[PDB]
Design a protein around this motif. Structure first.
Motif, PDB file in Angstrom:
ATOM      1  N   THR A 132     -77.160  43.360  29.970  1.00 21.92           N
ATOM      2  CA  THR A 132     -76.345  42.949  30.534  1.00 21.92           C
ATOM      3  C   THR A 132     -75.195  43.858  30.970  1.00 21.92           C
ATOM      4  O   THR A 132     -74.301  44.072  30.168  1.00 21.92           O
ATOM      5  N   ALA A 133     -74.960  44.238  32.451  1.00 26.03           N
ATOM      6  CA  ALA A 133     -73.298  44.664  32.986  1.00 26.03           C
ATOM      7  C   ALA A 133     -72.843  43.992  33.231  1.00 26.03           C
ATOM      8  O   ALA A 133     -73.209  43.927  34.676  1.00 26.03           O
ATOM      9  N   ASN A 134     -71.195  44.508  33.444  1.00 26.60           N
ATOM     10  CA  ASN A 134     -71.046  43.289  33.688  1.00 26.60           C
ATOM     11  C   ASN A 134     -69.377  44.627  34.976  1.00 26.60           C
ATOM     12  O   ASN A 134     -68.899  44.900  33.968  1.00 26.60           O
ATOM     13  N   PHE A 135     -69.648  44.725  35.450  1.00 26.32           N
ATOM     14  CA  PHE A 135     -69.057  45.804  37.066  1.00 26.32           C
ATOM     15  C   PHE A 135     -68.030  45.336  37.692  1.00 26.32           C
ATOM     16  O   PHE A 135     -68.280  43.849  38.480  1.00 26.32           O
ATOM     17  N   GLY A 136     -67.046  45.295  38.063  1.00 21.39           N
ATOM     18  CA  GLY A 136     -65.777  45.167  38.748  1.00 21.39           C
ATOM     19  C   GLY A 136     -64.140  45.773  38.994  1.00 21.39           C
ATOM     20  O   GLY A 136     -64.143  45.820  37.210  1.00 21.39           O
ATOM     21  N   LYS A 137     -63.457  45.507  39.901  1.00 20.98           N
ATOM     22  CA  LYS A 137     -62.574  46.236  39.451  1.00 20.98           C
ATOM     23  C   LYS A 137     -61.138  44.971  38.877  1.00 20.98           C
ATOM     24  O   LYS A 137     -61.772  43.949  38.280  1.00 20.98           O
ATOM     25  N   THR A 138     -60.799  45.711  38.324  1.00 22.85           N
ATOM     26  CA  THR A 138     -59.184  44.301  37.916  1.00 22.85           C
ATOM     27  C   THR A 138     -59.004  43.246  38.576  1.00 22.85           C
ATOM     28  O   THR A 138     -58.600  43.736  39.274  1.00 22.85           O
ATOM     29  N   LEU A 172     -77.046  53.631  31.735  1.00 16.55           N
ATOM     30  CA  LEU A 172     -77.493  52.239  32.969  1.00 16.55           C
ATOM     31  C   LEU A 172     -78.540  52.834  33.553  1.00 16.55           C
ATOM     32  O   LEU A 172     -79.034  51.700  33.773  1.00 16.55           O
ATOM     33  N   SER A 173     -79.357  54.010  33.150  1.00 16.04           N
ATOM     34  CA  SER A 173     -81.311  52.889  33.942  1.00 16.04           C
ATOM     35  C   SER A 173     -82.091  52.194  33.088  1.00 16.04           C
ATOM     36  O   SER A 173     -83.027  51.435  33.890  1.00 16.04           O
ATOM     37  N   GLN A 174     -81.714  51.865  31.956  1.00 22.27           N
ATOM     38  CA  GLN A 174     -82.550  51.175  31.094  1.00 22.27           C
ATOM     39  C   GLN A 174     -81.708  49.765  30.933  1.00 22.27           C
ATOM     40  O   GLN A 174     -82.520  48.396  30.619  1.00 22.27           O
ATOM     41  N   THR A 175     -80.497  49.988  31.835  1.00 24.68           N
ATOM     42  CA  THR A 175     -80.490  47.734  31.537  1.00 24.68           C
ATOM     43  C   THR A 175     -80.769  47.358  32.707  1.00 24.68           C
ATOM     44  O   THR A 175     -81.242  48.039  33.161  1.00 24.68           O
ATOM     45  N   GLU A 176     -81.200  46.354  31.733  1.00 25.78           N
ATOM     46  CA  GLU A 176     -82.007  44.979  32.757  1.00 25.78           C
ATOM     47  C   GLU A 176     -81.117  44.696  33.901  1.00 25.78           C
ATOM     48  O   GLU A 176     -81.660  44.718  35.098  1.00 25.78           O
ATOM     49  N   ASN A 177     -79.877  43.605  33.570  1.00 28.96           N
ATOM     50  CA  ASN A 177     -79.291  42.488  34.121  1.00 28.96           C
ATOM     51  C   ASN A 177     -78.185  43.112  35.027  1.00 28.96           C
ATOM     52  O   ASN A 177     -77.372  44.052  34.170  1.00 28.96           O
ATOM     53  N   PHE A 178     -77.912  43.051  35.853  1.00 41.09           N
ATOM     54  CA  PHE A 178     -76.736  43.925  36.789  1.00 41.09           C
ATOM     55  C   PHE A 178     -75.870  42.876  37.499  1.00 41.09           C
ATOM     56  O   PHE A 178     -76.573  41.554  38.017  1.00 41.09           O
ATOM     57  N   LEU A 179     -74.151  42.486  37.036  1.00 45.74           N
ATOM     58  CA  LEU A 179     -73.367  41.653  37.666  1.00 45.74           C
ATOM     59  C   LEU A 179     -72.439  42.644  38.151  1.00 45.74           C
ATOM     60  O   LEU A 179     -71.664  42.838  37.567  1.00 45.74           O
ATOM     61  N   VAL A 180     -72.084  42.669  39.545  1.00 45.07           N
ATOM     62  CA  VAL A 180     -70.979  43.755  40.113  1.00 45.07           C
ATOM     63  C   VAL A 180     -70.236  43.014  40.575  1.00 45.07           C
ATOM     64  O   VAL A 180     -70.855  42.303  41.562  1.00 45.07           O
ATOM     65  N   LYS A 181     -69.035  43.049  40.639  1.00 47.97           N
ATOM     66  CA  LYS A 181     -68.326  42.933  41.231  1.00 47.97           C
ATOM     67  C   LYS A 181     -67.332  43.679  42.682  1.00 47.97           C
ATOM     68  O   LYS A 181     -68.179  44.875  42.074  1.00 47.97           O
ATOM     69  N   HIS A 182     -66.956  43.210  43.081  1.00 49.14           N
ATOM     70  CA  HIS A 182     -65.817  44.348  44.170  1.00 49.14           C
ATOM     71  C   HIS A 182     -65.818  45.823  43.516  1.00 49.14           C
ATOM     72  O   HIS A 182     -64.780  46.164  42.221  1.00 49.14           O
ATOM     73  N   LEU A 183     -66.203  46.547  44.256  1.00 50.96           N
ATOM     74  CA  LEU A 183     -65.845  48.225  43.452  1.00 50.96           C
ATOM     75  C   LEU A 183     -65.000  48.831  44.950  1.00 50.96           C
ATOM     76  O   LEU A 183     -65.400  48.706  46.034  1.00 50.96           O
ATOM     77  N   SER A 184     -63.480  49.584  44.708  1.00 52.11           N
ATOM     78  CA  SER A 184     -63.133  49.964  45.671  1.00 52.11           C
ATOM     79  C   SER A 184     -63.649  51.967  45.478  1.00 52.11           C
ATOM     80  O   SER A 184     -63.652  52.336  47.102  1.00 52.11           O
ATOM     81  N   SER A 185     -64.037  52.614  44.678  1.00 47.84           N
ATOM     82  CA  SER A 185     -64.079  53.726  44.977  1.00 47.84           C
ATOM     83  C   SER A 185     -65.779  53.729  45.821  1.00 47.84           C
ATOM     84  O   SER A 185     -67.034  53.064  45.354  1.00 47.84           O
ATOM     85  N   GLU A 186     -65.848  55.626  46.375  1.00 52.73           N
ATOM     86  CA  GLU A 186     -67.638  55.911  46.618  1.00 52.73           C
ATOM     87  C   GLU A 186     -68.330  56.085  45.630  1.00 52.73           C
ATOM     88  O   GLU A 186     -69.725  55.733  45.938  1.00 52.73           O
ATOM     89  N   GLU A 187     -67.102  57.275  44.511  1.00 56.43           N
ATOM     90  CA  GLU A 187     -68.466  57.079  43.280  1.00 56.43           C
ATOM     91  C   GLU A 187     -68.790  56.078  42.771  1.00 56.43           C
ATOM     92  O   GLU A 187     -70.023  56.452  42.129  1.00 56.43           O
ATOM     93  N   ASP A 188     -68.048  55.036  42.728  1.00 51.02           N
ATOM     94  CA  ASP A 188     -69.208  53.858  41.732  1.00 51.02           C
ATOM     95  C   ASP A 188     -70.160  52.740  42.028  1.00 51.02           C
ATOM     96  O   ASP A 188     -71.030  53.302  41.369  1.00 51.02           O
TER      97      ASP A 188
END
Ligand SMILES: Nc1ncnc2c1ncn2[C@@H]1O[C@H](COP(=O)(O)OP(=O)(O)NP(=O)(O)O)[C@@H](O)[C@H]1O
Lengths: 560, 578
Positions: free
Chosen positions: A172-178, A489-505
């Motif tokens: 599981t991956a947890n992404f998001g701004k600080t 990233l491609s092999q990760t199963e679950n995703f939990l994404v909060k706000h990301l400001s950057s276009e690259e992300d």
DNA sequence: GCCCTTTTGCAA
DNA sequence: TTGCAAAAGGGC
């Protein structure tokens, strides 16, 4: 119970099927609307599809000039909703675009996309009910369905529940701004797992000193406070090198019975009791480094067990430890030749040094190779916290017990990286050794994972690649998808994404998972704290917007 | 036996010809639909072409405002199925785009594409029948005006399917494959984890074993999934498949957990499992093979750079001459004992004219005393014994096997030539030395194969997993094998899960391709660049995660990429059992 | 970041 | 007296 609008066109736009929907003046006057990103049901050919509202635009319908009509009404100052119903009835249309994601089949599985494009005359679009949404999510709530911050776009009764099958054995991956809720999300998941499924173990690598006690108004409370609130006793094992400061702190916040909830253990050992441990650490420090342990270190690593029967051989190992600076406990007797010295005393130490072989003499000569061990040495400990943690997490006693091992990394100073690598290597080796007899059944909680998953030859990279076989789950947070390798990233199963400001992300996120291409615009422009986009394989292979729960509210609500 | 719709336009879009088809209200009301990726027959000027459905969209026909008509019908709750036939017949149309792939001429020759653009007034489109599909799947590129090969026997590999749509599966339309395709050529098995890679690899290996019993295999089993059924699924392994087919004495399993593997083999194959699989150890006894110890110690220094020391370089070249001098060989045995290797009980070393027993401490001490109270480089070797300590990981007493030499004999031996052995290597049991030993074994196998060029072909297939790890290095033995092994009759079947990481030099020269769902965009883009025919399935492969669904392409005479649902090993075994 | 170059001890 | 190891600074 009736279709929202009328379907007027359909096509294949890339790898997805899309259709166009029109809302008429009557439906608009009844207050009916469609929110962007909302999930709808699509009936076509006797089959039901899940769809998402992607776009919305105004376009003239029939033979009309809306600009001229509205401008003329404004010029002549006529209330359009009270004086000219027929003028208002020829311009009040609206257009929406809806993408088909797939359909539910047999035992809750998902068939993605479609090869059949629906003819316009026989396609219908329906608002989805709470029962339908609950089935969609299901086949101890962590969050509830929400669309942005609109009123009426919140469904407190449609929840996503925590389940060990979702997290144990999977990544599981947890992404998001600080500042947007990664740690609160992690803590809520962990507290619900500990409360509902008490046979799952956790290994938390605490780098910021927030997962046990947290009293400042800059994060959610800690796991110790959560467990005290929920009445969970005897399940936390805290490892630290500040065992007195932490013991003092725990007593102000958990009261006088804090020992019923937390067990404090030291990260220090007596190396005069574990010379094999000292030699093994010195040997492994170089493999974890670039390469090539020396021959005099390999010889000791392989033959120190043999040497233990020879006092002459062991005397040189103890002398190397004493010369490297390690303090022995008072009254330590070392036997050499036919005499006994007291290395704790300077006179006896000098006598033995003057009075002083299978390779142990080279170890004694090159003693400064053990100096780093002085970051772990403390006379009179005799614990071997590495083995203690090994039987905490993989001990045969468990067969389901529940152990939350929290490591206070900062207290170790500059040895924390080496300690973490060594502990992970030991745990993975034991898990591999036990394959076919018992499952590991524990979850590694890893914050700021971009510092651990960088090199492909790392133990954490190997765990991320191969822990599903042995039953080791991983939950990692990084603040930025671009910091993680695309292979992980491609092999990760679950995703939990909060706000990301950057276009690259967001570009990296959608390059890793295609369905994440439909929410990048929302992510870029909606900085909402605690608003997550969740994606789970293989039962929910589409993105869902959840409003996540505060740990304080979860604790106050689970008492019922 | 009637055209599906009406053709209204044709043109050339790049290297291909395309036409536009329209489905009218009468056909749409009878349930006639065209699926994306479906194959159809195109009749034009008396010639039959193969076409594939590419796109589909709605477009108004004639003078009509579908939006206004449908909105006016909607606001009145008019059901455009039993109430307004005239309003329905003016809007119920649909558009499709079809590409012309080629045609079948003569006795199965496939002529690709076309230089003729069909006029729209006489072109017709037909739904293809099962017999026509069967005859189309068997066509291939041939020179000209020549007769078909009439080749060897063929086996069912899978059946035609069009995703997960109902009515998209054709169980009677099967792709038959000649296993010779996999002999001496390179096969790539791309896809996500858990989507059918292992099942199709086992099917390929079983077909090769049954059809060509003279071809050997070297499987480097990283995940331990090719011998028995794992405790996560129930698909039979190679040992159980060979038992079912009655193939005896062909599997040599090398492992360091012989007892556990023998227990599993017994519980799964019965009590006669020894007649189907032979278990051997991966550990060596260096008192039986001091040359191996010297070679390992000498080459460890070399592969890490810097010149090896003089004493080691001298021992490497003169240990065979030292074997005739017991006084010189006693120093080698003493060097091993000092390094710490455990001798077999009762070992005897002759020094001068006295016989010692190094397995006992008193005798070992006596021998040590006599040794020090210049016999070539042997004494220098004995003085620096700590260079051998690292062998304690690989050493076990009482083996006398040398798996490294045994495997080379198995795969490239004159006595065993013919009826090729199936060597399976249990890499996990090796721990950290798995990669080192794999590279060493492949190097010493390639050297012997190149030496034997003229007396006997190598004739074995290398099965490699996570191939992107080893094929990245262009100075590596595996890259060299991928490039040059065809000359010596060494085939390669590799599965990566990340094609983007495999060099385009390897990708362009691969003959067989089996592709499953790929999550990443770069992986699909590299596939499209490598092979042109994979350009029509890139959108499907990216957004359709279907398990057991593959796209197959066998070079060099296959017209187009074929989507298949692959047969299971359980059914293939029954088919071969009849 | 990685591949030469040096002082220093242990040997025979 | 020289080969060999092992740790450390310097050049590229
Ligand atoms: N679900 C939520 N609902 C409401 N407020 C929240 C929620 N999650 C987090 N917050 C607020 O956000 C603050 C910081 O949360 P936190 O979990 O530390 O985010 P974070 O992603 O960990 N930031 P950081 O770890 O520094 O990158 C908390 O103190 C709350 O005020």
């Amino acid at each position: 119970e009736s279709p929202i609008g009328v379907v007027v066109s359909s096509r294949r736009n890339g790898p997805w099927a899309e259709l166009t929907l029109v809302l008429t003046p009557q439906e608009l006057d009844q207050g009916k609307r469609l929110l962007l990103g909302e999930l709808v049901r699509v009936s076509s050919g006797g089959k039901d599809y899940v769809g998402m509202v992607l776009d919305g635009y105004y376009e003239p319908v029939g033979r009309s000039d809306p600009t001229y009509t509205l401008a003329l009404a404004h010029i002549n100052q006529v209330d359009l909703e009270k004086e000219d119903p027929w003028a208002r009835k020829e311009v009040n249309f609206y257009h929406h675009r809806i993408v088909l994601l797939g359909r539910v089949v047999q035992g809750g599985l998902f068939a993605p996309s479609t090869r059949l494009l629906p003819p316009v005359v026989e396609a219908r679009v329906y608002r989805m009910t709470e029962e339908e949404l609950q089935r969609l999510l299901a086949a101890y709530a962590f969050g509830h369905l929400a669309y942005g911050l609109e009123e009426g776009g919140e469904y407190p009764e449609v929840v996503k529940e925590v389940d060990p099958a979702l997290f144990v054995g999977r990544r599981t991956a947890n992404f998001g701004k600080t500042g947007f809720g990664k740690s609160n999300e992690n803590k809520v998941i962990l507290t619900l797992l500990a409360h509902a499924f008490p046979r799952v173990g956790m290994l938390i690598l605490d780098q910021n000193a927030e997962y046990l006690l947290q009293t400042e108004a800059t994060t959610s409370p800690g796991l110790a406070q959560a467990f005290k609130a929920l009445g969970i006793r005897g399940r936390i094992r805290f490892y630290t090198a500040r065992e007195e400061a932490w013991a003092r702190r725990l007593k102000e916040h958990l009261g006088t019975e804090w020992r019923e909830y937390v067990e404090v253990l030291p990260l220090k050992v007596d190396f005069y009791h574990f010379p094999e441990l000292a030699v093994a650490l010195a040997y492994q420090r170089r493999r974890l480094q670039g390469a090539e342990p020396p021959q005099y270190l390999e010889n000791a690593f392989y033959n120190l067990e043999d040497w233990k029967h020879i006092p002459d051989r062991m005397a040189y190992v103890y002398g190397a430890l004493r010369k490297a600076g390690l303090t022995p406990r008072k009254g330590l007797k070392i036997k050499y030749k036919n005499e006994n010295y007291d290395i704790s005393e300077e006179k006896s130490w000098g006598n033995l040094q003057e009075a002083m072989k299978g390779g142990a003499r080279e170890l004694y000569s090159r003693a400064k190779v053990f100096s780093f061990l002085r970051a772990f040495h403390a006379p009179g400990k005799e614990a071997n916290f590495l083995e203690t943690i090994k039987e905490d997490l993989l001990g045969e006693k468990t067969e389901g017990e529940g152990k939350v091992v929290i490591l206070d990394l900062p207290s170790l100073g500059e040895a924390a990286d080496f300690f973490t690598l060594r502990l992970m290597d030991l745990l993975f080796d034991r898990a591999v050794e036990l394959y076919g007899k018992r499952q590991a059944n524990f979850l590694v909680v890893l914050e700021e994972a971009h510092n651990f998953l960088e090199d492909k030859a790392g133990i954490f990279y190997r765990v991320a690649k191969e822990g599903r076989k042995y039953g080791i789950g991983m939950l990692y947070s990084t603040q930025s998808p671009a910091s993680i390798p695309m292979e992980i990233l491609s092999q990760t199963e679950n995703f939990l994404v909060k706000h990301l400001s950057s276009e690259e992300d967001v570009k990296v996120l959608k390059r890793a998972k295609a369905p994440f291409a439909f929410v990048a615009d929302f992510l870029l422009s909606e900085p909402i704290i605690g608003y997550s986009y969740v994606y789970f394989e293989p039962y929910q292979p589409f993105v869902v917007p959840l409003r996540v729960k505060l740990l304080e509210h979860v604790l106050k609500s689970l008492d019922s």
